[PDB]
């Protein structure tokens, strides 16, 4: 949750909430996809240092981050751009390689 | 990075198909290949049908089969039911960035 309309140069805060689990003991990917069907990575972190690495796409104007007691993981868009445009996902890793669940998407629209 | 061909795929029921993927980096990484594959159902989110490149997910019925070397891996469905139309996308987990494949539609040849 946290998607809609929002004007170019916004600012918005996408929410994931996590259940089945413990939030803190796998990692998380926000990934989105846009009207044309393309997929693309968002961003990566590590959920325990509060760490997120990302694309040049957003390097800068996203920022991923999560709480651990409260099973939740944030994405705080800035500055967006009409390419921003896509349904966002968020999805619980598994192992190392590829992701356990889980999220129903979360349409954002930058007009 | 990764290259995914082909574009469309018309397959018949009972056919059998194969779509392939080229990764601009090695995606081996401690002994394993982080390289999986995703059907995203018309109208939902993607699912995981293999990962770490061959590995079938529990769930997914034995359609599937994943393979590859060096930077060629391949998604094969022996048997095409009707259920697996949708598009396909292979997405690797060895560095960083992660990334996806542009997509295979599978579309099922009919009268």
Redesign the interface.
């Known amino acids: 949750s946290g998607p809609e309309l929002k004007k170019p140069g916004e600012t918005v805060k996408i929410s994931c909430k996590a259940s089945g689990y413990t939030f803190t003991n796998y990692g998380m990917?926000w990934?989105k996809?846009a009207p044309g069907?393309?997929?693309?990575?968002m961003g990566?972190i590590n959920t325990s240092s509060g760490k997120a690495?990302?694309?040049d796409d957003f390097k800068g104007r996203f920022a991923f981050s999560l709480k651990p007691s409260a099973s939740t993981a944030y994405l705080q868009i800035n500055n967006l751009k009409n390419e921003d445009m896509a349904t966002y996902?968020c999805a619980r890793l598994?192992?190392?390689?590829?992701?356990?669940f889980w999220?129903?998407?979360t349409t954002l629209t930058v007009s | 990075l990764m290259t995914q061909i082909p574009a469309s795929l018309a397959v018949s029921l009972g056919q059998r198909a194969t779509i392939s993927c080229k990764a601009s980096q090695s995606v081996d990484?401690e002994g394993?290949s982080?390289?999986?594959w995703y059907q995203?159902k018309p109208g939902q989110?993607?699912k995981?049908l293999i990962?770490?490149a061959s590995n079938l997910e529990s769930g997914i019925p034995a359609r599937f089969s994943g393979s590859g070397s060096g930077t060629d891996f391949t998604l094969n469905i022996h048997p095409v039911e009707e259920e697996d139309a949708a598009?396909y996308?292979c997405?690797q987990?060895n560095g960083?960035?992660?990334?996806?494949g542009?997509?295979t539609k599978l579309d099922t040849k009919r009268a």
């Open positions: 990917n990934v996809q069907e393309g997929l693309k990575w990566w690495t990302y694309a996902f598994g192992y190392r390689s590829y992701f356990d999220g129903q998407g | 990484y394993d982080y390289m999986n995203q989110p993607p995981l990962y770490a598009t996308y997405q987990s960083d960035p992660y990334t996806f542009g997509g």
